[PDB]
Ligand binder design. Structure first.
Ligand SMILES: NC(=O)c1ccc[n+]([C@@H]2O[C@H](COP(=O)([O-])OP(=O)(O)OC[C@H]3O[C@@H](n4cnc5c(N)ncnc54)[C@H](OP(=O)(O)O)[C@@H]3O)[C@@H](O)[C@H]2O)c1
Ligand SMILES: NC(=O)c1ccc[n+]([C@@H]2O[C@H](COP(=O)([O-])OP(=O)(O)OC[C@H]3O[C@@H](n4cnc5c(N)ncnc54)[C@H](OP(=O)(O)O)[C@@H]3O)[C@@H](O)[C@H]2O)c1
Ligand SMILES: NC(=O)c1ccc[n+]([C@@H]2O[C@H](COP(=O)([O-])OP(=O)(O)OC[C@H]3O[C@@H](n4cnc5c(N)ncnc54)[C@H](OP(=O)(O)O)[C@@H]3O)[C@@H](O)[C@H]2O)c1
Ligand SMILES: NC(=O)c1ccc[n+]([C@@H]2O[C@H](COP(=O)([O-])OP(=O)(O)OC[C@H]3O[C@@H](n4cnc5c(N)ncnc54)[C@H](OP(=O)(O)O)[C@@H]3O)[C@@H](O)[C@H]2O)c1
Ligand SMILES: CCN1CCC[C@@H]1C(=O)N[C@H]1[C@@H]2C[C@H]3C[C@@H](C2)C[C@@H]1C3
Ligand SMILES: CCN1CCC[C@@H]1C(=O)N[C@H]1[C@@H]2C[C@H]3C[C@@H](C2)C[C@@H]1C3
Ligand SMILES: CCN1CCC[C@@H]1C(=O)N[C@H]1[C@@H]2C[C@H]3C[C@@H](C2)C[C@@H]1C3
Ligand SMILES: CCN1CCC[C@@H]1C(=O)N[C@H]1[C@@H]2C[C@H]3C[C@@H](C2)C[C@@H]1C3
Lengths: 263, 263, 263, 263
């Protein structure tokens, strides 16, 4: 069971933390006494998040601005963040490329850009982070969506990127389990959350209820700190069970017995 | 009920058709009397396939050699294949990057190349083909894997790209259904198949049973000509129900109430 | 889509109609202009229901009083009710034995009596009605419970009888589909309803929320009239899917091919 | 991990033990050194089983002949068998009424008689055994079928009675767990088994393969000894997953939390 003391003095990176859920994550970490380093494109927005973190009582707080479209930035961001904190205990991968809802009709560049920003960068970050995470037996939060488990019309590029995160990171978890690598990987599956981006983008099109971002952010922390495989925050107590896919869990357990683990 | 006459005089691209399942797909289409354009990188191997297709009874058979890592090739390949046949009725997307079963050790370049060859090129080919396929009320076969519905240790880059196909193409199918677009999309879910690539790549590592490549190829063709949403060929009548994800089907169905469709 | 016009002039039996859901079912049918014959053991209560049905607009309304513990009453009841209305279109089997919530302690006599009242009478009633129902291509509603799909502490005798109802009536439906017998059978799965009996019986014991009896009654009517296999009224949009058991549906589908239907 | 010495000197009742699975269960217990009392109606068949059990190594073997249609016999049988062995460690409820396959067309007596033999007698036997089983912290095997979890055409009376067993005994188990009563209850879910009765009844109607009775009997004994909630013996490795019903397990878990257990 979660205690906020579990983040006291912990060294945590938060991406996409200028606004929305990621900003709320940073705020909760600050109140728990964590060291944070926040990132996003907007310097202006990030300065303001850092000031507020300090006031809430973070152990320390710093920002680094850049685009996660740029793989070299992602790699160098992590090195400098670990240098600022003297290590890393938790990597929270929360950023995402904004894409307007439309029926797909040939926007290949957006398919490319969505995969770069929402997927390849997450992998780059995690690779860059992995030595420090192994040293501290730390944790990664991979922030995804109900739309990275099922499909929804009007968001094909985004959903493909989120499916990919499941395929990659769940594979990596399985490998870490067999190899006795004590770095936890928590895939966070979120429903509609009441950030600004969401409410505007869905206005007039998607009518589901939205859940509060402040709560959403807290549950992401809690699940990742408890080293959960998955964390569901989706507006219903029943939906996590419909998304949990027990058939997949069965097939994975049985298929594992087919490997020659000695070789 | 499938009849081989359904492919007589039809115009069919097969990618990854120099060997393995792809080659088998090409032979079957030839026996059914289709027009075919095959592709892969190896010009020598494609020629062998084309001569064999002519002998087997193909209406027409041509090849174009190139790499699906190059999105410009992919775009040009379709327009040329379409000029060679005078149109396009079916696009079989079967190619995949050769990989080996090894734990992920941070090989970022391979994640990137896998995603290009296995995923982004499928999208690029589909978009190039879409005009011709709307004209013919045609079909797309998307060749995937059980590893694009559940994860397996030692293949994280491949599984990520395959999961990505499901999120992308399944979303597209749903948009095509609401918009009454007469282009079907069949996600092919394959278990282990006795291609030379799979036998050698699993030897001493993964010891599950394999199914026969010739029948595998015929089942892709059949399920695609019959315009099925999904086609499972996995060595079991039971397993397709544990991969079909009843929970996801329920959520997607219920999701229709959540859109303002008139808008 | 349901229209109340579908029950106008229809000939309907309602059992356990002196209070609770059964009473409400009677009222709703009256408003739609059905003919109703109602039953239970309390004469005075039944006389009040009949009068109110007439006031509300029933084409006709009669009661016959007796105990469904008595299999000869059940049979004779059906014959008299069809005689009163000149036929039968719908059999609503709603009565149940009162049972308090305690741990089972060897009360064998109660296991017996619960099976007589809740199960055997329902079979006997159905058997008596069947000729009339085949003549009208009519319908049976079998009123059951979430406790006829899963188990709950403190109601073992009751649950046993509700489970029997599913095994029996669901087999009968399967036999009727196969034999082109056009009598529909609707298993109604009710969550907690705010009848006086349920409120009293669960008070300080079972604290889950209760749905309104008036709507519950209407939903039984609509689902049965629409000829659904099953009708869930459990106060959740999602729970019906955790109850209706996709695994069972798959198995029943696959097993049907194991029969030698020609024979 | 089961070991056969687990049953050496244990005291076991086997009903329906004159032929079929019940006979094979008696024989396996004998081999393991158990004390057995066997019952069915056929005196002469039970004599043969007893002599053979003694040959195989049974610590002791007795029979009592009688019909489980007779509830008084059932009650007295248990007291007498416990007298004969000086206690009871395991009650294996295996008997069933044979019912010809037929479309249901109003055989109300068969519905009654099947519920008496197949269900009521199991309850009465369990209640009569309960003091001895509480004293030995013993076990009950409730032998059911795939057709006590899903429905099959032509066997409605049988299926109703097996469904009832699940509702009753699974409720009692959940009460025993809460009341810390150490008597285990194992529901045995069997596929088609090659007893002479099954093979003759299904000949030319139901074409599914039948599994061996000898192994079926051993698995019942093993799962019951291991104090499992359910034991599946069915034909396919996948079927226990499909019949396992995770939705029911979830709902039972979450419902249980709605009780005021203090009260
Ligand atoms: N809101 C929802 O309903 C919902 C539902 C399901 C899942 N989620 C998920 O939750 C996470 C957060 O969503 P949100 O609604 O809080 O999003 P948001 O309010 O749009 O915030 C996005 C954050 O990511 C950053 N970002 C965007 N493009 C970037 C780029 N190229 N490089 C670096 N940073 C970039 C932003 O800052 P800059 O613009 O300054 O870079 C911003 O800080 C996402 O992973 C998302 O898919 C959200
Ligand atoms: N075999 C299995 O057990 C199995 C299981 C599940 C799913 N699948 C799937 O079924 C499909 C067929 O697999 P397979 O075993 O038949 O594969 P395979 O025998 O290795 O054949 C792969 C084909 O793809 C082509 N290819 C590889 N790299 C390419 C590139 N960069 N650009 C263009 N073409 C390239 C190949 O020719 P070049 O090398 O000459 O380009 C070859 O024709 C794949 O999508 C795969 O994911 C296979
Ligand atoms: N209320 C709930 O929360 C709930 C939950 C799940 C399912 N259900 C189901 O819905 C149905 C009705 O529930 P309810 O709450 O409305 O029950 P109720 O208020 O107790 O009414 C039961 C009716 O059945 C009759 N009945 C009882 N014993 C009888 C007997 N021996 N012979 C003939 N009739 C008898 C009663 O009248 P007399 O006493 O005049 O005979 C009464 O009309 C039952 O099938 C039940 O299992 C209810
Ligand atoms: N065989 C299958 O495919 C199959 C499949 C699923 C489940 N099962 C289950 O496995 C269990 C055994 O099946 P089986 O195939 O072995 O049955 P079986 O060969 O027909 O034997 C039934 C036993 O129960 C007895 N019995 C029948 N009527 C009785 C009565 N009125 N009172 C006392 N005993 C009576 C019989 O002896 P007397 O006639 O001498 O009384 C016989 O000993 C049954 O519970 C059944 O539901 C069997
Ligand atoms: C409609 C599908 N929604 C419903 C539940 C989750 C999924 C989603 O990720 N939406 C997108 C969309 C609206 C929100 C803000 C951005 C644009 C990012 C997502 C959430
Ligand atoms: C072990 C996972 N197998 C079980 C069947 C699905 C899956 C897989 O896609 N294998 C891949 C892997 C091994 C073989 C050669 C290539 C890489 C392509 C597939 C077959
Ligand atoms: C707590 C189990 N409830 C939860 C929801 C449905 C199941 C039920 O069948 N209750 C019956 C039982 C006890 C109560 C009074 C009557 C007989 C009617 C129901 C409520
Ligand atoms: C058709 C459903 N079968 C198929 C698998 C198990 C189930 C069953 O229990 N059948 C009955 C039926 C045939 C056999 C002998 C009796 C009559 C007892 C059962 C097995």
């Amino acid at each position: 069971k979660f205690r906020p003391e579990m983040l006291q003095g912990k060294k945590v990176i938060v991406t996409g933390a200028s606004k929305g859920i990621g900003r709320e994550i940073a705020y909760h970490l600050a109140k728990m006494g964590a060291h944070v380093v926040v990132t996003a494109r907007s310097k202006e927005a990030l300065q303001k998040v850092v000031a507020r973190c300090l006031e809430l009582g973070a152990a320390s707080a710093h920002y680094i601005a850049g685009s996660m479209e740029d793989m070299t930035f992602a790699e160098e961001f992590v090195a400098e963040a670990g240098n600022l904190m003297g290590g890393l205990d938790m990597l929270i991968l929360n950023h995402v490329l904004y894409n307007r809802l439309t029926f797909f009709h040939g926007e290949i560049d957006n398919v490319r850009k969505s995969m770069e920003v929402n997927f390849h960068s997450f992998v780059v970050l995690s690779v860059a982070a992995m030595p420090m995470l192994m040293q501290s037996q730390g944790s990664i939060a991979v922030v995804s969506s109900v739309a990275g488990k099922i499909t929804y019309p009007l968001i094909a590029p985004y959903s493909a990127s989120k499916f990919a995160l499941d395929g990659f990171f769940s594979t990596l978890r399985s490998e870490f389990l067999v190899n006795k690598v004590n770095v936890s990987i928590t895939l966070c599956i979120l429903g509609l959350i009441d950030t600004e981006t969401a409410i505007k983008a869905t206005s007039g099109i998607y009518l589901g209820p939205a859940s509060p971002k402040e709560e959403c952010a807290l549950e992401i922390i809690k699940g990742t700190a408890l080293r959960q495989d998955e964390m569901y925050y989706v507006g219903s107590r029943w939906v996590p069970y419909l998304l949990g896919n027990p058939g997949r869990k069965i097939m994975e357990f049985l298929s594992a017995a087919e490997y020659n683990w000695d070789n």
